[PDB]
Amino acid sequence: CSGGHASNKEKEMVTSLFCKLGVLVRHRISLFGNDATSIVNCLHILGQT
Amino acid sequence: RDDYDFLMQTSTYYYSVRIFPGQEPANVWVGWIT
Amino acid sequence: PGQGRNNNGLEIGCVVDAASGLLTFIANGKELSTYYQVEPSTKLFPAVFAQATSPNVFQFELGRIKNVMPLSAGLFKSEHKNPVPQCPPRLHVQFLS
Amino acid sequence: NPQPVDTSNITIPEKLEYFINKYAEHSHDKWSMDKLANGWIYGEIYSDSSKVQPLMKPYKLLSEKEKEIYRWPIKESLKTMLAWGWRIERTREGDSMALYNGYSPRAIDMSNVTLSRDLHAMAEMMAENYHNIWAKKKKMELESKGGGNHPLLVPYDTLTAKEKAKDREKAQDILKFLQINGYAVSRGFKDLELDTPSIEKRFAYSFLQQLIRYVDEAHQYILE
């Protein structure tokens, strides 16, 4: 209630970021230099947000 | 100077307030309150 | 003159006539136009309202002018006939809180 | 690399003559008090060894040859305030003085005149500029000499409070005396447009479209 409003534009941009990075992680684990763990951790955090 | 008899018989009293140079004077009011 | 003075600090003098209730103000040796007439038996407290724009704001000078008693003569009964100005420890500055 | 604003671009306005008045009378009065403090007294002849004054007289009796160069630092102190374009005005109470129109000089009181916070920052910048000017002249002089170093070569920020006391007291006295005259200085210009409704300027916005662009680029390079 103190503030910290997140704009609607900001949130569809967050959703598009989530979807596009999911597209990146699609079948690209081999190309990722073992950073798939970091990929899926960011997957979580954007999921909760 | 001042008349001693007039001072003995009068009932007029006086005080003064000096606003120091640098204190904005429109921000200062002087007078009496009840 | 107004505005900023730097010859000396502004001396605002308040004169009260306890027998007539006339309140007259003197600024830098001249009589101001503002005057007040009060009711009999009115008790008047010397007061200064100021907004601070300096480390030193103002001071209560308890002197006297020609043909007038000092404030201590009016305040204290024992000094009713003493023309010498005085500031006994009972008199002190109070503020609204 | 000090870079004071050039002063030849603009010129002094005419209405500031009355502000230069009373202030030259300051500089003379305080400096005559300094003369009394260190010992100078009247002589029709100037004697540096015998500690002798010819230049006591009221600023009116002081000649035109004095008037020049003596105000010159005052002229550049005024030029520094005008060149940045800071908006300066008068109250009509200020023109009240003009409409109302040996010798013992009057002791002139800086004691309780106080500045505002924005005006501090304002005068801190102008005194910082004065120091930048002054130090740039030292780098010219010492490079002409070809040798030596100076403790004050460090920037205004690096200088200590006692080292900066000179410029602080100069800035304070001048802006406080502009206070006493009632001139009012403020910011030079206001913003052409405040796009406060814009979500685009928010930090998260720019952060995300930078992310959008770079991650889209990365995605297409991963495709490649």
* Residue of C15, C43, C81 with shortest CB distance to B12: C15
Residue C68 exposure: Cα atoms within 13 Å on the Cβ side: 21
Alpha carbon distance D137, D132 (integer Å):
9
Q: Which two tokens stand for residue D31?
A: 């400096």
Breaks (C-N over 2.5 A) in chain B follow: none
State the best of D108, D112, D116, D172 to mutate against chain B, taking most chain B CBs within 10 Å: D112
Alpha carbon distance D224, D222 (integer Å):
5
Q: By CA distance, what is D181's nearest residue in B?
A: B22
- Backbone phi, psi, residue A41, to 5°: -65, -45
Closest alpha carbon to C34 in D96, B34, B25, B30: B30
Alpha carbon distance D1, D133 (integer Å):
10
Alpha carbon distance D214, C77 (integer Å):
88
Contact between chains at B21 and D111 (C-beta distance less than 8 A) = yes
Alpha carbon distance D211, D34 (integer Å):
66
Alpha carbon distance D93, D141 (integer Å):
46
C79 near C93, Cβ under 8 Å? no
C2 near C16, Cβ under 8 Å? no
Contact between chains at D109 and C6 (C-beta distance less than 8 A) = yes
Chain B positions touching D110 (Cβ under 8 A) are: 22
Alpha carbon distance C51, B23 (integer Å):
9
User: D66-103 burial, b if ≥16 CB within 10 A, otherwise e?
Assistant: eeeebbeebbebbbbbbbbeeebebeeebeebeeeeee
Which residues share a beta bridge with C45?
B33
CA distances from B6 to B3, C13, D36, D199 (A): 5, 20, 46, 79
Q: Which two tokens stand for residue D217?
A: 């680029």
Residues in chain D, how many? 224
Q: Which two tokens stand for residue A22?
A: 């999911």
Alpha carbon distance C82, C70 (integer Å):
8
Query: What technique solved it?
Result: cryo-EM
Q: How many CB atoms lie within 10 A of CB C16?
A: 24
Angle between helices A8-25 and A36-48 in degrees, nearest 10: 150
Closest alpha carbon to A49 in A25, A4, A36: A4
Burial of B17 (0-12, 13-18, 19+ CB in 10 A): buried
Q: How many CB atoms lie within 10 A of CB D181?
A: 20
Closest alpha carbon to D73 in D204, D210, D170, D178: D170
Opening angle at CA C49, ends C46 and C53, nearest 5? 135
Q: Which two tokens stand for residue C87?
A: 């500031």
Chain A positions touching D212 (Cβ under 8 A) are: 13, 16-17
Alpha carbon distance C56, D119 (integer Å):
19
C:D CB pairs within 8 Å: 32
Residue A39 exposure: Cα atoms within 13 Å on the Cβ side: 18
Nearest chain B CA: its distance from D134 CA (Å): 30
D96 near C5, Cβ under 8 Å? no
Burial of D199 (0-12, 13-18, 19+ CB in 10 A): middle
- Chain A residues with CB under 8 Å of a chain D CB are 6-7, 9-10, 13-14, 16-17, 20-21, 23-24, 28, 31
C85 near C62, Cβ under 8 Å? yes
The 8-class DSSP code of residue C16 comes to E
B-contacting residues in C 13-42 (Cβ below 8 Å)? 13-19, 23, 25, 36, 42
B:C CB pairs within 8 Å: 146
Q: What one-character-per-residue DSSP string does C23-90 give?
A: EEEEETTEEEEEEEE--TT---EEEEEE---SS--EEEE----TT-EEHHHHH-STTTT--S----TT
**How many Å separate Cα C65 from the centre of its chain?**
11
Closest alpha carbon to D174 in D69, D101, D88: D88
Q: By CA distance, what is D108's nearest residue in B?
A: B21
Alpha carbon distance D198, D110 (integer Å):
47
Closest alpha carbon to D26 in D92, D99, D77, D65: D77
**Amino acid at position D101, single letter:** N
Residue A26 exposure: Cα atoms within 13 Å on the Cβ side: 10
**Amino acid at position C64, single letter:** R
- Backbone phi, psi, residue D139, to 5°: -65, -35
H/E stretch holding D88: strand D88-90
Q: Which two tokens stand for residue D193?
A: 């447009």
Q: Which two tokens stand for residue D188?
A: 């030079």
Closest alpha carbon to D177 in D124, D77, D117, D110: D110
Q: How many CB atoms lie within 10 A of CB D179?
A: 22
H/E stretch holding D52: strand D52-53
- Resolution, given in Å to one decimal, reads 2.8
* Residue of D199, D209, D219 with shortest CB distance to A20: D219
Tell me the helix, strand and coil percentages in chain A, rounded to 5: 65, 0, 35
D154 near D59, Cβ under 8 Å? no
C23 near B14, Cβ under 8 Å? no
**How many Å separate Cα D35 from the centre of its chain?**
25
D182 near D94, Cβ under 8 Å? yes
Place of tokens 């009065």: D29
Nearest chain C CA: its distance from D1 CA (Å): 37
Cα of first residue to Cα of last residue in chain C, in angstroms, is: 35
Q: What one-character-per-residue DSSP string does A30-49 give?
A: TTTTSTHHHHHHHHHHHHH-
